[PDB]
Design a binder for these strands. Structure first.
Length: 320
DNA sequence: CATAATAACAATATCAAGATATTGTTATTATG
């Protein structure tokens, strides 16, 4: 209760921008958050805080649990922005503890189901070739896609904040590996890849990737993308990227699902493990190494194992 | 009447075991 007044400038600016729009939805949630932070101003009693949060929770009732959790993240971030990390509301404005447990349960359950039913990525070579061809395109979006397919970085990392640099092999450059900076979703942890330049494998010669990236950065849309926030990047590119991926790998992607930009990261993991993995490491370890995870974290890699390579599928049936 | 824009709505994958930050889908709105 040290600060009793505050303003979440993010939401407010997002509303002022949306005051004059040609079309689209009405920012109802942003409005509820704004009115929330507004009502929070001047409060010193915690019972009324609890009542406010009880009503606000009572609002988003007939919705999805994931949606509710995400919205709670929104509210909490708004509170942190407006007042600070010392406000009692942060201990009040949180989700029911039995909700997060159900979430975790469902998550690990899904992963477990995916691990018992791997998808055979039969035409993966064609996809890799498609990305490699996108590496030589003049459309920055395409170059971005191909970069996702080849270096395996996330769309946010690739389009907004990647720094690929030549990796030395003793003396000269490495043909099948580059350097990378910086990782996303790290939240600035002690043992995360925050501000860490580490070596990653690539699925085509390093000169080609470096060239395509150098072209990507110096473009107009590339400059428009650099340093962008996640919401900005979303509203700017998300649907276009989605439909371009939709149209690209239309008839070469596994029939069990639809082409999504993040599948290229999974395929990157599987293939680079299939080609470059040393004999004294496990799959989880190599995955954690090349994907850049928290220190001593091998469970996050479990979410990246959903595909199975045709050759493995073949020689596994060789035991007949 | 489609039509495109827009944010609600939703799920996944990370750092840390209690949530945050990314990626992914659809209903609404103004408008032409």
């Amino acid at each position: 209760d040290y600060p009793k007044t505050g303003v979440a400038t993010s939401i407010v600016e997002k509303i002022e921008r949306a005051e004059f729009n040609t079309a689209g939805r009405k920012p109802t949630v942003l409005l509820r958050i704004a009115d929330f932070i507004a009502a929070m101003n001047g409060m010193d009693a915690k019972q009324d805080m609890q009542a406010l949060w009880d009503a606000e929770i009572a609002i988003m009732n007939g919705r999805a649990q994931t949606t509710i959790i995400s919205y709670i993240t929104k509210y909490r971030n708004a509170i942190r922005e407006a007042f600070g990390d010392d406000h009692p509301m942060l201990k009040i404005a949180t989700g029911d503890a039995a909700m997060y447990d159900e979430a975790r349960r469902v998550k690990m359950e899904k992963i477990a189901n995916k691990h018992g039913a791997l998808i055979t990525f039969e035409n993966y070579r064609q996809v890799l070739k498609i990305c490699e061809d996108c590496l030589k395109s003049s459309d920055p979006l395409m170059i971005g896609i191909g970069l996702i397919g080849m270096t395996g970085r996330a769309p946010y990392e690739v389009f907004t904040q990647a720094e690929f640099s030549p990796a030395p092999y003793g003396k000269g450059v490495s043909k099948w590996s580059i350097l990378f900076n910086g990782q996303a979703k790290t939240k600035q942890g002690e043992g995360t890849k925050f501000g860490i330049t580490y070596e990653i494998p690539v699925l085509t010669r390093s000169e080609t990737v470096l060239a395509a990236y150098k072209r990507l950065r110096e473009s107009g849309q590339g400059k428009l993308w650099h340093g962008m926030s996640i919401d900005d990047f979303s509203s700017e590119t998300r649907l276009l990227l989605r439909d371009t991926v939709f149209n690209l790998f239309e008839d070469v992607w596994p029939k069990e699902e639809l082409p999504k930009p993040y599948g290229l990261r999974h395929l990157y993991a599987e293939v680079a493990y299939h080609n470059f993995a040393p004999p004294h490491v496990t799959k989880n370890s190599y995955f954690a190494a090349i994907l850049g995870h928290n220190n001593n974290d091998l469970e996050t890699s479990l979410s990246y194992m959903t595909y199975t390579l045709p050759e493995d599928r073949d020689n596994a049936l060789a035991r007949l």
